[PDB]
Design a protein around this ligand. Structure first.
Ligand SMILES: Nc1ncnc2c1ncn2[C@@H]1O[C@H](COP(=O)(O)OP(=O)(O)OP(O)(O)=S)[C@@H](O)[C@H]1O
Ligand SMILES: Nc1ncnc2c1ncn2[C@@H]1O[C@H](COP(=O)(O)OP(=O)(O)OP(O)(O)=S)[C@@H](O)[C@H]1O
Ligand SMILES: Nc1ncnc2c1ncn2[C@@H]1O[C@H](COP(=O)(O)OP(=O)(O)OP(O)(O)=S)[C@@H](O)[C@H]1O
Ligand SMILES: Nc1ncnc2c1ncn2[C@@H]1O[C@H](COP(=O)(O)OP(=O)(O)OP(O)(O)=S)[C@@H](O)[C@H]1O
Lengths: 686, 67, 67
C-alpha cells in the first residue's frame, strides 16, 4: 500500500515544491483532458528541461490552493514508483500481483486519485490496455518526443488512449518572469543578493550563445552557479587574509628556523624578523577581526531572511486555517519590524561590507559563461588591455610588413571583444590574395599563438583534398544508414566541442562548388547542419582563407594589375560560383605585396634565433659578421620568388659544413663559433 | 509556393524572416534547408530518412519530423 | 541543482587523478567550508552485476543502495 503510495499534494502542502509562473493554457488543456470520460489521459510532449514535471507539481499547487474547479476538489495525485515496482519480484507474477493490487485500490479509490506516471517508456501494460480502453483509470503521462517516436508509435493500443500536450519552449520575457518567481528560493538557499540586470542579461546571453540546451533551465543553472560561487567566495578565506596568511606562515616557518639557534649570539640577531612578526600579527589580526564582524553581519541578515520565510510559511498556513488573528497579525505584525531592522541591516551592510561581496551581478555571469565556452565580458580589460594595445607589435614580432592586413584582423578582434558584431554573423571571414612571399598561414599561426597561445588549436583544412563530389562526405559527415554515419564530419565535431575558435582554410582554388556553397551557409547566418541531424553554431568563430588566385597570375602580371583588376581576373574563376552573396558576404579582401630587402634581413635574423636554440641545446653560439649576413642577404633575394630562398639558402650554405664539423667531433662544446668568411663561401670557425 | 529570382542584396532571406517574424513572431520557427548540399544521390535519405534496417530509419529526416 | 559535473578530455589527461588530488585536498582540510568532513566514495559496476539472472534482483540492489 504505502510502498507505492507517493503523494505530491502533501509535498506542495509542506512547501517542499517550487512556484510555477505564467502557465495557464496548457494547464487549462490538462483540466479539459481531466474532465473527459474516455481517452481521458494526457501525455506531456516537450523538450528536456522545458518544465513538464514542474507543470504537474504546480498544478498540484493550484489544487492545494483550492484554485482548481469544483470537479477537482478533494482529488489527489500520486506519482508512480517504477523503481519500487521492480523491487522484489522474485518469481513470475508477483509483479502483476502488485500491479493488480494497484488496480484494485484504484478501483475502490473510485475516481478520487488522478494518477501521474512519468518515464512512460518504462511501463506490463498488457493488463492496462483494457482499463485504458474503458477509461476506468485516470492517469497522466509525461515523456519526450523521441520516446514518442521509438516507444508509443509502435503500439496502436496506446495512441487510442492518450492525448498530446505540446509544451512549447517558453520565451525570453516569460522566463524573466519565472526567474522573478524563483529568485526568492535561490536567494534564501544561496544566502546572497540578486539584481535584476543579472536576470535580464542571463536570459539574453543564455538564449543567445548556448544553443545546445533550452530555456528556462539553462539560465536557472546559471543563477545556481553564480550564487553558489559568490557563496564560495564569502565562505572561503579572503585574499588579504590568505596572502597575509602566506606571509605570516612563511614568517612562522622562517621564525621556526630562526628561533632554533646554532650560535645564539649570531642566529638570535633575528630582532627584525620578530618585529615584522608582531607587525604582521597586527595587520593579520585586524583584517581577521573585520572579517569576523562582517561574517557576523551576514549571519544576522541570514537569520532575518529565514524568519521572514517563517512568517511566509505561517501566513500561508493562515490561509488554510483562516485564522483572522494570524492573518491580521502577520499582515500587521512581525514583518513591519523585520522590514525596519532588515533595511537598517542592509544600510549597515552599506557601511561595513568592505572585504567581501554579496550582491551577484552581471560580471559574475560573464565569468560563468566564460567558464563554459570561453568569452568573458568584464575581465578582458585588465589583463587583456596590454596585448590588445600591443597587438600589432605582437604580430610584428613574428610577421613583418603587410600592415594593412594587421590592421584588418586587429580591427576584427576589436569589433569582437568590443561588442560590435552582428549576432547573426561569424566574427571574421577574410580572403588573402595577391602574390605570396609573405607567410599567410604564418600570420594565421601568429594568431594561433596569439590568442590560443599555440598553433595546435587552429584547425586547418585543405581545399585541394576537396575537389570531389565525395569531399562533403569527408568534412561534414555521412548521410544516414551508411558507412561513416555515426561518426560525423570532424569540422562540425571540432566546432561543436570548443565553439569559438579559428578555422583555417587553404588554397581555395581546388575545391568543389558545393563546399563553396556549404561555405555559403557558413558565411551567411553562421550555422550549419550535419548529416547526423542537428545544426552547429559559427557566429563567434573566424574563418580565414589563404588563396592563390592572385599568385596564380599576379607574379606573372606584375605590370598593370590593380586591386580592382585583380578582383576581375579573380572573378574569372571566382565569378561563376562566388556571387555577391559570396563575395559580398566575405569581410575583407586582403591583397598582399612583395618584399623589401630589409624585411628579408629581418626574416633572416628571425631564423637565426631558433638555430641559437639548437645551439643552446648543445652548448654553442654563432657569431656572424655583418658582411656574411650581408652575403645571406644578397643570396636570398629573388624578385619573383620573394624572400623565400632565405632559409634554404642559409642552411644549405652554412649548415652543411657546420654539420660536417660537428659530426666530425671537431667542434668542442663550451665554445663560441664565429661565421668568418674565409672566402666567399661562409665558414664556421671555433 | 513561390520562386524568387533576382539580384543580390534584395532581401530574400529578409523577406522570409519578415514573414516568419510576422506570423510566428520569431525568425527561429522558420525551417531552413539548403539545397546546395544536395547534389548527390544520398540527399533524399538525408532530408527524408533511411530505408528500413538502418539507423536513420530509426531517426528519420528533417522535413518529415519537422512538419 | 545540476549538482553533478562532467569531466571531458582525452584519457591520461588526469581526470581520475583530478578526482584523486581533490580528495587529497579534502583530507588535508584545505577544502572550502561545508565540505569539511563530507566523504567521497567511488561506485563501480561489477559488484552490481552479480547474480541477477531473474528480473527485479539488480533493480532492488540499486534501489536499496539509493535508500
Ligand atoms: N515555469 C517554470 N517554473 C518553475 N520551474 C520551472 C519552470 N519551467 C521549468 N522549470 C524547471 O525545469 C526543470 C526541468 O523540467 P521538468 O519539470 O523536470 O520536466 P522537463 O522539462 O521534461 O525536464 P526533465 O526533468 O529533464 S525530463 C524542473 O526541475 C523545474 O524546476
Ligand atoms: N614575410 C614573412 N615573414 C615571416 N615568415 C615568413 C614570411 N614569408 C614566409 N615566411 C615563412 O614561410 C613559411 C611558410 O609560410 P606560409 O604561411 O605557408 O605562407 P603561405 O602563404 O601560407 O603559403 P601556403 O601555405 O602555401 S598558402 C613559414 O616558415 C613562415 O615563417
Ligand atoms: N531590402 C532589404 N532590407 C533589409 N536588409 C536587406 C535588404 N536587401 C538586402 N539586405 C541585407 O542583405 C542580406 C542578404 O539579403 P537576403 O535577405 O539574403 O536576400 P539576398 O540578397 O537575395 O541573399 P540570398 O537570400 O542568399 S539570394 C540580408 O541578410 C540583409 O542583411
Ligand atoms: N596532473 C597530473 N598530476 C599527476 N598525475 C597525473 C596528472 N595527469 C595525469 N596523471 C597521471 O595520469 C593517469 C591517468 O589519468 P586519469 O587520472 O586516469 O584521468 P584520465 O584522463 O581519465 O585517464 P583515463 O582514466 O585512462 S580516461 C593518472 O592516474 C596519473 O597517474
Amino acid at each position: 500500500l504505502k510502498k507505492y503510495t507517493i503523494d505530491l499534494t502533501e509535498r506542495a502542502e509542506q512547501g517542499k515544491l517550487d512556484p510555477v509562473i505564467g502557465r495557464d493554457e496548457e494547464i487549462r488543456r490538462t483540466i479539459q483532458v481531466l474532465q473527459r470520460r474516455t481517452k481521458n489521459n494526457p501525455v506531456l510532449i516537450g523538450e528536456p528541461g522545458v518544465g513538464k514535471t514542474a507543470i504537474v507539481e504546480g498544478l498540484a499547487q493550484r489544487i492545494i490552493n483550492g484554485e482548481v474547479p469544483e470537479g477537482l476538489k478533494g482529488r489527489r495525485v500520486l506519482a508512480l514508483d517504477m523503481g519500487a515496482l521492480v523491487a522484489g519480484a522474485k518469481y513470475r507474477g508477483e509483479f502483476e500481483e502488485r500491479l493488480k493490487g494497484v488496480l484494485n485500490d484504484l478501483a475502490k479509490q473510485e475516481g478520487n486519485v488522478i494518477l501521474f506516471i512519468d518515464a512512460l517508456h518504462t511501463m506490463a501494460g498488457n493488463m492496462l490496455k483494457p482499463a485504458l480502453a474503458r477509461g476506468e483509470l485516470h492517469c497522466v503521462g509525461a515523456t519526450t518526443l523521441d520516446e514518442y517516436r521509438q516507444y508509443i508509435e509502435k503500439d496502436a493500443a496506446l495512441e487510442r488512449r492518450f492525448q498530446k500536450v505540446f509544451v512549447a519552449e517558453p520565451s525570453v520575457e516569460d522566463t524573466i518572469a519565472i526567474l522573478r518567481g524563483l529568485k526568492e528560493r535561490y536567494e534564501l538557499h544561496h544566502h546572497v543578493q540578486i539584481t535584476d540586470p543579472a536576470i535580464v542579461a542571463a536570459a539574453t546571453l543564455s538564449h543567445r550563445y548556448i544553443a545546445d540546451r533550452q530555456l528556462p533551465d539553462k539560465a536557472i543553472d546559471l543563477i545556481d552557479e553564480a550564487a553558489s560561487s559568490i557563496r564560495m567566495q564569502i565562505d572561503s578565506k579572503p585574499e588579504e587574509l590568505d596572502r597575509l596568511d602566506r606571509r605570516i606562515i612563511q614568517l612562522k616557518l622562517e621564525q621556526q628556523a630562526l628561533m632554533k639557534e646554532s650560535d645564539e649570539a649570531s642566529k638570535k640577531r633575528l630582532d627584525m624578523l620578530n618585529e615584522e612578526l608582531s607587525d604582521k600579527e597586527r595587520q593579520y589580526s585586524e583584517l581577521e577581526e573585520e572579517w569576523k564582524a562582517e561574517k557576523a553581519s551576514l549571519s544576522g541578515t541570514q537569520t532575518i531572511k529565514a524568519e521572514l520565510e517563517q512568517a511566509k510559511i505561517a501566513i500561508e498556513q493562515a490561509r488554510r486555517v483562516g485564522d483572522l488573528a494570524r492573518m491580521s497579525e502577520l499582515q500587521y505584525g512581525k514583518i513591519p519590524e523585520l522590514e525596519k531592522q532588515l533595511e537598517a541591516a542592509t544600510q549597515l551592510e552599506g557601511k561595513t561590507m568592505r572585504l567581501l561581496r554579496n550582491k551577484v551581478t552581471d560580471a559574475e555571469i560573464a565569468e560563468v559563461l566564460a567558464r563554459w565556452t570561453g568569452i568573458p565580458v568584464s575581465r578582458m580589460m585588465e589583463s587583456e588591455r596590454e596585448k590588445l594595445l600591443r597587438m600589432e607589435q605582437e604580430l610584428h614580432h613574428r610577421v613583418i610588413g603587410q600592415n594593412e592586413a594587421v590592421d584588418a584582423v586587429s580591427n576584427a578582434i576589436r569589433r569582437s571583444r568590443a561588442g560590435l558584431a552582428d549576432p547573426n554573423r561569424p566574427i571574421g571571414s577574410f580572403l588573402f590574395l595577391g602574390p605570396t612571399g609573405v607567410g599567410k598561414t604564418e600570420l594565421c599561426k601568429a594568431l594561433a599563438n596569439f590568442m590560443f597561445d599555440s598553433d595546435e588549436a587552429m584547425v586547418r583544412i585543405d581545399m585541394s583534398e576537396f575537389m570531389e563530389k565525395h569531399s562533403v562526405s569527408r568534412l561534414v559527415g555521412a548521410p544516414p544508414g551508411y558507412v561513416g554515419y555515426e561518426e560525423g564530419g570532424y569540422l562540425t565535431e571540432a566546432v561543436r566541442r570548443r565553439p569559438y575558435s579559428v578555422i583555417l582554410l587553404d588554397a581555395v582554388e581546388k575545391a568543389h562548388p558545393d563546399v563553396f556553397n556549404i561555405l555559403l551557409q557558413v558565411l551567411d547566418d553562421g550555422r550549419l547542419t550535419d548529416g547526423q541531424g542537428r545544426t552547429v553554431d559559427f557566429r563567434n568563430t573566424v574563418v580565414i582563407m589563404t588563396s592563390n588566385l592572385g599568385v596564380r597570375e599576379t607574379e606573372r602580371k606584375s605590370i598593370g594589375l590593380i586591386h580592382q583588376d585583380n578582383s576581375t581576373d579573380a572573378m574569372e574563376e571566382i565569378k561563376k560560383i562566388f556571387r555577391p552573396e559570396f563575395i559580398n558576404r566575405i569581410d575583407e579582401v586582403v591583397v598582399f605585396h612583395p618584399l623589401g630587402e630589409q624585411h628579408i634581413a629581418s626574416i633572416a635574423q628571425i631564423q637565426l634565433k631558433r638555430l641559437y636554440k639548437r645551439l643552446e641545446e648543445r652548448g654553442y653560439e654563432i657569431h656572424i659578421s655583418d658582411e656574411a649576413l650581408k652575403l645571406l642577404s644578397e643570396n636570398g633575394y629573388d624578385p619573383v620568388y620573394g624572400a623565400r630562398p632565405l632559409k634554404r639558402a642559409i642552411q644549405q650554405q652554412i649548415e652543411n659544413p657546420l654539420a660536417q664539423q660537428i659530426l666530425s667531433g671537431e667542434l668542442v662544446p663550451g665554445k663560441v663559433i664565429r661565421l668568418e668568411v674565409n672566402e666567399d663561401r661562409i665558414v664556421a670557425v671555433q
